[PDB]
Each structure stands twice: as C-alpha cells, then as structure tokens.
Amino acid sequence: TMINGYEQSDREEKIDILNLESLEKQAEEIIPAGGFGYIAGGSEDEWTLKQNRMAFHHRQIAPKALSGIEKPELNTEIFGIPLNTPVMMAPAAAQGLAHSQGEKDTARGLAAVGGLMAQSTYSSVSIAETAAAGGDAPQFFQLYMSKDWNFNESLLDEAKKANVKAIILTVDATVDGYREADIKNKFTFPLPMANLIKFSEGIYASAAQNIRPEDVKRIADYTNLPVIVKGIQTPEDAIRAIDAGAAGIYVSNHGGRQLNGGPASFDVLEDIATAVNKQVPIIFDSGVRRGSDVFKALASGADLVALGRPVIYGLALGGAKGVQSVFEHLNHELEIVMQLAGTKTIEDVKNNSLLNIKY
Amino acid sequence: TMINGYEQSDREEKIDILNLESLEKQAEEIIPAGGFGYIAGGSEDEWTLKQNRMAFHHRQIAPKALSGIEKPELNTEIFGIPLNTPVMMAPAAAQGLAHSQGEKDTARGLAAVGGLMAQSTYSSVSIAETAAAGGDAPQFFQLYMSKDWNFNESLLDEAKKANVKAIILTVDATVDGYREADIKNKFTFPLPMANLIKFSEGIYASAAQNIRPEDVKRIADYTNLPVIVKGIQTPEDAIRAIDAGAAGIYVSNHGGRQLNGGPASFDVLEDIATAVNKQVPIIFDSGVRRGSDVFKALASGADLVALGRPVIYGLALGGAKGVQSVFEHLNHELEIVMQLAGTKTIEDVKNNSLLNIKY
Amino acid sequence: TMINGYEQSDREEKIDILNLESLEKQAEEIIPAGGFGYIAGGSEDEWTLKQNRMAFHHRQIAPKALSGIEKPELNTEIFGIPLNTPVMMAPAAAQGLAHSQGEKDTARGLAAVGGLMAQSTYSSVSIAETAAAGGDAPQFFQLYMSKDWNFNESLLDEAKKANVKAIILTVDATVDGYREADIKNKFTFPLPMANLIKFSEGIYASAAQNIRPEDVKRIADYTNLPVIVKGIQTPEDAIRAIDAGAAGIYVSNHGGRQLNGGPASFDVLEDIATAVNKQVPIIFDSGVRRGSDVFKALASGADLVALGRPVIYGLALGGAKGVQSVFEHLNHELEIVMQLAGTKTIEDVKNNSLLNIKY
Amino acid sequence: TMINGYEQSDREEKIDILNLESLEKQAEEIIPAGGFGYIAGGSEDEWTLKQNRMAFHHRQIAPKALSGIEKPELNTEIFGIPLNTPVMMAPAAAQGLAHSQGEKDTARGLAAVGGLMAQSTYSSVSIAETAAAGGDAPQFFQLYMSKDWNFNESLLDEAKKANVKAIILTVDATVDGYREADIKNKFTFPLPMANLIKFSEGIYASAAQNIRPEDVKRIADYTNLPVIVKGIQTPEDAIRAIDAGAAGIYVSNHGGRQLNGGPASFDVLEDIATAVNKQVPIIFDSGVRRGSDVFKALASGADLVALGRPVIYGLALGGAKGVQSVFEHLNHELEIVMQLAGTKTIEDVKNNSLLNIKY
Ligand SMILES: Cc1cc2nc3c(=O)[nH]c(=O)nc-3n(C[C@H](O)[C@H](O)[C@H](O)COP(=O)(O)O)c2cc1C
Ligand SMILES: Cc1cc2nc3c(=O)[nH]c(=O)nc-3n(C[C@H](O)[C@H](O)[C@H](O)COP(=O)(O)O)c2cc1C
Ligand SMILES: Cc1cc2nc3c(=O)[nH]c(=O)nc-3n(C[C@H](O)[C@H](O)[C@H](O)COP(=O)(O)O)c2cc1C
Ligand SMILES: Cc1cc2nc3c(=O)[nH]c(=O)nc-3n(C[C@H](O)[C@H](O)[C@H](O)COP(=O)(O)O)c2cc1C
C-alpha cells in the first residue's frame, strides 16, 4: 500500500520475537527511511534516549527463595476498569507510518491481550474508527491542547461519544525537541491527521505552548472523566498536577524525544511515587523493553507500564497480530521474573523492595 | 561418538590452560552449536551474566609485606569431610552435551584433585554410576523437587545408597529464565535424563514451582543428611532457610541463567555472610574464573567456591584429565595470590580484610 | 587565498548545521592539516578535553509541567551592555588559520546575532580593523601581559581607542600545554600577529609567566575599564581575583589545551559561583556544544557562555555568515530547552535548580 | 648483537618522544617477541596493570591563577643526596633483553640527567660494572633475599664496595605472578644473571619466600645503610616496616606484575603517606607516564617517582641517550604542569592540594 509515494506495511501475522530491542533492526528493513528515523530518533545527541535503557541497571530484583507461590497473575484495574496486563500502549502519533491500518491494528492487538490503549490527537485514523476497531477494549484519549477551546471541546466530545474512560493531557511537547534524524531525512509527514481534518469540517507550534494548572481543572469539569497529566519528571510537578485536579500522573520523558539532558524516566519514578503516596494511580513509560524493566517500574511506584516504539515496530512487522505478539512476549518475560521473585499478583510486585547496589 | 545425531567429545588428556575464561572460545570449536549455546548462555540480555564477572572488581586484595609465610595450603573440611581444595564442582545438568562419558569423567577429575562434586537431578548418567566413577571422593546430590514425594523419596534413597554426604535443594529455577540462545538454536535435548528414566521404571515446568520452608525440614527429616538451600541472594532468605533446618547456604544466581536484572552473586555475598554469622557453612558460585576471584569469595564469607561452565568446557576438551586440568590451574592461581597476600591456610583467607576502593 | 603556502578559506554563506560537534569533521576537509591540529588539539592525552564534554552529564535539567510560559527570550546585559544572546565568542588567536578575513568575519557574525565578541592579543588582524568590522557590536579585549608595561599600556590604549567595553586578562597560559598534534605536524604559524607587528613600529615564553594580583589592580587603574580574570578553576582564586579589583570571573580551562589532569570546566563552576555569590558577573567556557550545555552553565552560576572551536570551524565553512549560523543554531537549541524547562527569560534559567543523579 | 640467538639493540641516539605510553608500540618493532612480552606483561587479566593508569583520573590538579611564580625547579634531595629531578629509575631485571649494554646504558642515561638509579639483584650486568658506568651518579641497590645469608652478605658487600647510598628490599615477589604473555611465548631468559654467576665463584622460587620484620633490622645492622621496603600497598605495612627499622617506604605493586586484583598503586598512596606522616621519605611507582601523573604522586605524599617500562623501551630505542631522552621528556611535561599549577619547587608540589571530583 502507498499514500503520496510512501510504502505502508499490509502484514497481518504473529511474529517470532527474540526480544523487544531486536524489533527495531527488523522493522528498519520494511519502514521507509524517513518514517523509521521519525520513530527511532531522540533529541540532540540522544543521551537521554540511551539513559532511559541504562537506568534500569540502577536497581536490582532479589531472587526470592522458598516463596511458596506458583502461576503468577498479570490482571489489574485502573479507575475500576479490569485489564489482563499492567502493560499498555503509550499514545503515539501517526501509526500510518508503520501500517496501512495504522491505529486500528494497534487497537485490535490491545483488545486481543485485554490491555489498555491510549489514542493520540495526532492519529492517522479518527477517534471513532480506532474505538470501533477495539470493540469494548478500554481506551484513553491523549489531548494536545489548542489556544482555541472550541477545538479542545470538539475532540473531548468525540472522545466521550467513543466511550474513552480517561483523558491524558500531554504537557512535555509545547515545542518539538531538536531531532537530528528528521533534519538529516528532510522528513515531511506524507499522510494526513484524521482528527484535525475532521475538526476542519465543523504542528506542535492553534498548539498551546502556554499550559497552566487551570487548564487541567477545565478539561476535568467539561469531560467529567479522570484527567492524567503526562510528561511529569519531578515530585513538585506531580503535587502541582494533583492540586489542579489530576486523577493520575504519567511519568514520562516522551521516550527521550523532547528535553535531551533531562534524567532517565526510571530515575525520577520512585521520588514522584513517594510524593504521590498512592493518592492517584501512576503510569510509567520511556525505555521499557524486558520483563525485569516492567517488574522494576511496578516495584518503584508504577501502577501501569506503557511502551511506544516496540509496538510501532510490531505493527509494521505483523499488523494487529504483530502488536498482539509484542504484548504476549513482554507478558511472558514478566511472568518469569514474577515467579523467580516470589510475586504472585501485580499488587505483590508493587510491594517488592528492589536492591540498590551501584554498577 | 554420536547420540541422536549429536557429536559428543571422546577426548581424555591433560589440557594446556592459559586461563578459565579462554576455555569457552576453545570449547566452541568442538561442542555442537546448540549444546554450546545451552552451556554459555544467560537470560534476557545477559547483563547479570556479565556483572557476575565485573563484580570481583568491587573489592581488592592487599599485597601483604613481611608476612613471614611460605608454601600456602589449600586443604579444608566441610561437615567434617576433608578436601584438598576449597574449589568444588557446581551441580550442572546434561554433561553428556560435552562428552560421551558425561558426569563420570567429571567425578574422576574431582577425585584426582581431592575436591567435592555436586551431582544434578538432571544428569546424563545416573546417581549410582557417577558415585561409582568417583570412588571414595566425597559427593553431594542436588535435588529438583517434584509435586510428587514418591519421586523425591526415590532419588533421596538412590543418593543415600550412593553414600552422598549432603543434599543441595535448588530453589532459584521454579521456571526457566528467558534464554535467547536456546530460542535462536531451537535447541531440544538430544540425549536422555538417567535419573528420570530410572524413576519411570518403579522440564522445569510433576517439577514443583511452589517451594516452602516446610519442604527443607521434610528432606532433612527423611534423609538425615545435611540440607543446603541453593539460589540465595538475600540475608532474609539465608535466615529463613537456617530457621527451616538448612545445614548450609549456597549463594548463587545460577550463573546468570535465571532472574536477569538481579545483582551479581559476589555483590550480595558479604551481607549474607554477616547475617549467617558462621552458624552454617556457605558455598558460593556464579562468575568465578581466576585465583583472585576465589580469594575474594573466601575473604567475603564463603567456605567453598564452585564453578560450572569452566569445568564443562574442560570436560569437552580433555574428559577426566581435562576436568582435572581445570581444578589444577585454578589451584595454581589461588596459591600465588595466597603467597602474595600472606595467607598460609584457607582459614587465613577467610580472616583477610579486602579493600573497598570504587573503580 | 594563500599566505606563505597556507590555503585559507574565502567562503561567505549560511551553513546547514546538524549540530556544533559535527562542524569539526566538516572543517577538517578544508582547513590545512597543521592548522586543523592547532585548533582541535588539547594537551597530554586530551583527557581534560574529553571530560569538558562528559561533565555536562553530571547534572540534569527537569522538564517543567504546567509552567504557563511561551516564547522564551534570549536577551541579557553585562556591565549595562545589552546582548540578544548569552552566547558569546571566546578570545581565540590566529583566526587567519580558518579564513582570509580572519577575526573580521567573526566580528561581523557576532554583530549579526547581537552577541559579544572577545578579541585576542594574538589576532591575525589588528584591534582597530576587528572593532571597525563589528561596527557598534560590543567587544572585549583579551590581554596577554608582557614583562614590558610599555607594551601592555600600548595595546590597552589601542583597545580604549577601539571602544572595547572590558579587558580580559588571561592567566592560565604562562606556558603552552604539551600539545601532541603540533609536535606531530611540526606546526609553525604561517601568518603574522597584527598587534605585535604594530607594537614593533612604535610565543607564550617579553610574555610574563609571573602574574600577580597587583597586575589586575594596575590594568584596572590604567584603563578605567572593568577587568575580568580568565582561567579560574577554584573558588579561592575567584575570591583572590575579586580582592585584587576584578569586575568579573571567566571560568575556563582554555578548552583543555593547558593543564591536562585538571578538572572539566563545568565541574568547578557551581563552587566558584557559590563563593562569588553574585558580587560580579561570571563568564563560562570549555566544552559547550548543545542548548542543554548552555542551559546547565547558566543554571550553575554563569551569566555568559563562550564558545571557541565551534565558531572557528564555522568561520572556515562560511566566513561571516558561517559564524552567524553557529550562534543561530545554538540559540535555537537553547530556546527549545528553555520552553520545555519553563524558563521564560535568561534570569529564569539562572534561578533553575538542576537535578544531580549519578550516571 | 646476538646472545644465544636473541637480537639485542645496539642503538645510541637521542629519540623523538611524542609521550612515554607511545614508546611501547615503538619498542615492539625492535625487541624480540618473547622479551617484549616479558617487559610489557602483567598478571592474570592485567586489570591491576590497567588501573595503575586509570587511577590518576581519581584526583585532579587545580590550575592556579595569579601565583606570581616563574621558571619552576626540579631539584630535590634524599638522605642528603642532591638530585636534578624527583623522577628516578625503578629496579628492573634483565635490561640485556632491550640492549647489548643493558644496565650500563641505563646508568649513563641517569647520570646525564642527574637522577637516581636503582640496580636489581637480577641484573644482566654486575653491581661493579653498573656503578662504574654511572660514575659519581648516586645509585641504590635492590636486594632479593636468599634463605642463605652468606649470599645476602656477599651482594651487600659488593653494593657497599660500589658506593650505593641505600638498599631496597623487594618483598612483593616471593612468587612470580601468573603472567600469561610468558606462558604464551614459552619464554626462557636467553642471557645470564651477572650477580648470581659472581656469587657462584666464591628464579623467584635458595629465593626466600618467608620474609619477616627481623630481616629488615638485620640488613640495616649489617650494611649500616638506609633500608627501604618496596611493595607496600597498606598503611599497616608501612608502619610495620618503619617499626622494624626501614629508613624509607617504596609504594609499588611491581607495575601490576604480581597480585592482580590488588588496588592501583596510586589509590593507596595518600593513606600510606598519612600513616607515615613524613617520618621517612616515600618512593612511588607503577603506571607513571605523564607530567600530571608525577605532579599528582608528589602532591599525594611521594618524595620520589620511579618508572620501569618506559625507560626499558627508551634503552632499546636509543641506549644511554635513549634513556636520557625519556627522563628529559617527563621532566618537560612536569615543568609545564608546575608552572600552570603555581608550584615553584618540588616542596611546593608536595604542599599542593588535589581536587577529588568523581569521573
Ligand atoms: C513515533 C512516536 C510518536 C509519539 N507520539 C506521541 C503523541 O502523539 N503523544 C504523546 O503524548 N506522546 C507521544 N510519544 C511519546 C510516547 O507516548 C511515549 O512516551 C514513548 O514512546 C515511550 O518511550 P519508548 O518509545 O521507549 O517506550 C510518541 C513517541 C513516538 C516514538
Ligand atoms: C549448563 C549448565 C547446567 C546447569 N545445571 C544446573 C542444575 O542442574 N542444577 C543446579 O542447581 N544448577 C545448575 N546450574 C547452575 C550451576 O550450578 C552454577 O550455579 C553456575 O553454573 C555457576 O556459574 P558459572 O557457570 O559462571 O561458574 C547449571 C549451569 C550450567 C551452565
Ligand atoms: C585555536 C584556539 C586559540 C585560542 N586562543 C586563545 C587566546 O588567544 N586567548 C585566550 O585567552 N584563550 C584562547 N583560547 C581558549 C579559548 O578562549 C576558550 O577558553 C576555549 O576555546 C573554549 O573551549 P571550546 O573551544 O571547547 O569551546 C583558544 C582556543 C583555541 C581552540
Ligand atoms: C621487566 C621488568 C623487570 C622488573 N624487575 C624488577 C626487579 O628486579 N626488582 C624489583 O624490585 N622490581 C622489578 N620490577 C618492578 C619495577 O621495579 C617497578 O615497580 C615497575 O616496573 C613500575 O611500573 P611501570 O613499569 O608501569 O612504571 C620490574 C618491572 C619490569 C617491567
């Protein structure tokens, strides 16, 4: 399939996954060079991108002897919504760069593993189509605010009509990071932005760079849904968001694509969780690839753990069944760790105390 | 020699050893690719495998000036049993992957250097044959528990009949780690499991994933032998094992094959030893390759130091005499360190205070 | 253009800059080998050169959520002089090695972005020509003291006549560092030193190796301009300079060209700033290449941030417009960071608290 | 020149030295493979060899602003003996491996720069010839003790007759380290041991492995010379040596050739110096190659700084004039650092306070 001379994947098949990191070298044979650069890249020298991986080495999981547990269970809840896994899809623009079906194959994959999907404002496919593809699989919607509230109120209405269970407000992207891969490729989006086209019938730069605490109160009061602030990297900011009416905190550095020279996401998670003190659920992302990565995030104060790039690569390699493969593989790796660590349930993982030796 | 199309080594000869690490590149020319992958591999990205080596850099041995010692002695005891060396063979499944004689050549090698051998439940050769090959060389037996106690009680009987002096209960392998090399090779064991075949006349997944402290009391009461819990990586768990009736603690992370993202074995040894406070002997393994590695383990709270992979490589390269070469080489390296450090006996090494500079 | 068989650049054009580090590999295709070695090199094994880059990893910038700022402003002042950017040109000898126009194209570049230029005593072009090229763009003059005060007083007079707004006294170069690249190239300056030729009508070794605190008082009293001591790497020395009559402190290790085995410039900045306690403005250089580098310097106690090598490379690649490109690129990168960090103005960046996690 | 089929260097010429590290790659083109391996090698995996270099990164030299010093002076004294440099020749066996003249060209080199030479028991050339070649240049003699005191007393007599000013007792080599290069090369010394041949007319294994504190008292009482214990790596051992009658402490790990897994020599220097509290002079070696290395050793508690390998390489490349070149080059690098650091004399370097940032 082509769209303005860009080759999109049409694959639909389970994929043999060695691990999630190795999906990147595999996806690069099939995703056009400019789109691939767009997905894999981070900002400046990609130091924060690299540290997002390294930082998991900063804590260690104790093997547990004589636990008396078998057959660990991945099931959990958020805002009373049941999930089969604590692993979820992070909001990710322009999945049409990977596959002709784009976000619809993502939604089907997530529905297949009973996991949570976050839709992006900057989707290749509209809110209604993506929610329709997912059936009754729970979805969140991620809003990029306009200076224009007529636009904000229209997308929130479309989201409410689609039965989304929460709004993610993304606040760490008021401007694009300096992304060298997009500059080298002279990359321009070859396909359209469904939700923007639709507003237009009744990029980062109408968006709003100026975002205040009153804007969280306002979205909460309009939607009457739980609102989650995404991009938090400090305790003070988690407190400030809860004070303004947030129902959750999404600890993220946008996969190292924004403020390069900021810390690895993992390294600020426990501090934020200590400040939040279980007042609201916490979602965590940026650098998650192995079962041990997920275990450590849950043990450090996360309730849910989101991936971005590994899923987009799986979407290119296998469409809906590709996405499914990604979540099944990470679930497998996480089950192994939970057994060896003596954590029966996801609540046991959160109560687990990590070692802090310096390597 | 062949067995279901798998080439086994028939070599029997002393081997020139530069060092134990270099045995891996040498063994790979002769062990079939899938078996080699099975032996060399660790779990996930093998970070814990790598750290098992690195962690020895975390403490340093003081050269001692004017010690007034010569001709250091490697002799020691466990449970009143005399050994010529504190270096022992860790329990290791399926030595038939390296050599037609498998565990029998291992047993002969260990008998030749007056060292202790641990037999594995998942041996290529039965308990009785392995004990027969070793003559009067002391051996331990390593049990993988079944949900079925009729099976546990049969292997413990076979072990008692073979004059084993202790039981090792291995508790860190209730499920296989995620081992990428076995997945890449599509590796299936080409040869049988002697002790299982024998039960069947009157893999990790009858075994028992649920292991409790009462199961240590039970094995001790049945066998009336000392029981050693293997896979301990925390002080709390060493205490919990002693409380349940363990006669020893085997500090091990299974050579980095299980819970990847757990600490290097060496890094938790001194803490465990401080908690144990010489109430019971301690065995230590995972990453041991040089004389200084052994010295540091003994100085940090070990009574015995076990190897796995370096011996299996030596078995492939030289059978019984190959195994012997491995233990003679490590003994040489350890004698040098003991002389330069001013430790006359193995008890002097345990009383040695290591430096803790950060490199 | 040639001068004693040395090829000089004549280019005049905007340059596409991926980033400032990548200018070095680009400049090397066009600057003759010996001149290139002179510019890129540091002293001994260049460990201090390398650490000047690494040390920026020692602190991290917090992304700020819900800042309520847009359109950050780069404007600032020193000694009441308005600048469009806190990024300035460090004093740098012999720009004729890069371009036929030398320091004149530098001056024009800096005037184009409304930034501050420091002239060097060891210029290819005289004080008067360089100041003439810059028009009304503010410039400082960097003095290398002679044992002969008749020479000092002549250059300070030439500087005063050119309307320079301050004197930089450089005290970290009483002897050349051991620079291996100059030894390998057998490098001899192929072009003359304008300000020295001019004195001679009415290298490091008349200069003065013995520099005292009375020499700062003396230059201040003669010129009646603010005097800034450059090369400070300790709090005690910043205090000693202020005590002797310095109006500013220039934290610098001369781009790792002098005392190899001394600390990275960044690593002593906050200590010096704590001791100085805003008594005088602070200029910072050595290893600055990205927006995050500049943000971190300002946040750690700098008022201005100077570059050397990246500008010289830009001068070779594009003359006046090349230099301009360098400052526009670093300004862009700095604007992005300021937006994501929630710092509206340059005073907000100085009030920003950096994270101190260990990587 | 040949000796039992081994090619020896006959060169006599000043050598162009980029730096001391680069002498190793240059010497390897001319020294036969087995001899080269003997000189360059360390023990086990050479980790301690590597750290001897790395550890100099653990402290940093402050550039000093406004010092008011010029023309730094390298002159010093030990036991009232004047030297032109604090850089000295460490005792080094078998210099005949590098050059037909062996230790005689070393002695002439050291006499040319007014530096101190240590002779080795295991010299290619006798005590009397080496002392004769050096003229009135001060020399020390390094004793390897025999179980036989008739041998000890004969070499000490030969040393006293040669006007040596002190005895070094080397105590860190009671057995050879495990040196892999000598094992790979099947290396056997192709030339004789002059001082042993001479005893025989009226390797490490008659020597004495058992060395006590009474043996220091005994050598001091017999020779009536100052006795220096070499190989000290702990404060306790420096105290124990002073208690037994040592007149100096030689902090050394034998260039990383002995106890691999022991600390870098530099890392224990300040502790030893704090314990010694200037009761006796301290000599320091193992990993010294740059001016900054020497400055840091002096600043950390050394009185003299010895080299081994860099001199042996220089002896191969240029004989007497080669050795001279090595000491002149390191003197140059040290003069530069002393000027930039504001240390006029060698006593000023010892009073210098190093920075301790972690890199
Ligand atoms: C190609 C791509 C598009 C993205 N689009 C969005 C987006 O529209 N909204 C958003 O809030 N975050 C976006 N992100 C950030 C992700 O939500 C998430 O924080 C990140 O991808 C997690 O890091 P990982 O890719 O290493 O797992 C995007 C990330 C990628 C790689
Ligand atoms: C090929 C192989 C088979 C093993 N089989 C067993 C086993 O059957 N039982 C057990 O308790 N440990 C087993 N182990 C773990 C070892 O007992 C030991 O902890 C490990 O090999 C030590 O690390 P090293 O190989 O670096 O020395 C095995 C290890 C290897 C490499
Ligand atoms: C080629 C070159 C010439 C220099 N000339 C001078 C000079 O004449 N006076 C001076 O005070 N500093 C001089 N410096 C040091 C710079 O002022 C500045 O401290 C340094 O270049 C900053 O490090 P950077 O090049 O990594 O940004 C020079 C540096 C270079 C690379
Ligand atoms: C080839 C060689 C021979 C040596 N011979 C002796 C010796 O006979 N006696 C001794 O006390 N130390 C000996 N050493 C150790 C040196 O005295 C010194 O501690 C070491 O070479 C310093 O480290 P460096 O080579 O990195 O500078 C020798 C070292 C080398 C490399």
Residue numbers in the entry:
A (entry chain A), B (entry chain A), C (entry chain A), D (entry chain A): 2 to 203, 213 to 369
From the reporting publication:
Alpha-hydroxy acids are oxidized by a family of FMN-dependent enzymes. These enzymes use molecular oxygen to convert their substrate to product with the liberation of H2O2 as a by-product. PaLCTO is annotated as lactate oxidase and its closest homolog in Pediococcus acidilactici proteome does not use lactate as a substrate. We describe here structural and biophysical studies of PaLCTO, which revealed FMN-dependent folding and oligomerization of the enzyme.
In order to study whether monomeric enzyme could incorporate the co-factor, we incubated it with FMN and subsequently carried out SEC analysis to see if the protein oligomerizes in the presence of the co-factor. Refolded protein had similar spectra to WT native PaLCTO and melting temperature (47 ± 1°C). The structure was solved to 2.60 Å resolution. The structure proved that PaLCTO gains the same three-dimensional structure as WT PaLCTO when refolded. We also saw signs of two conformations for the chain S201 –A219 in the structure of refolded PaLCTO, but due to modest resolution and lack of electron density the chains could not be built. Like WT enzyme the refolded oligomer fitted well to the SAXS data. SAXS analysis of refolded PaLCTO were also in line and indicated that the protein had a molecular weight of 151 kDa, Kratky plot was similar to native PaLCTO and Dmax was 113 Å as for the native tetramer.
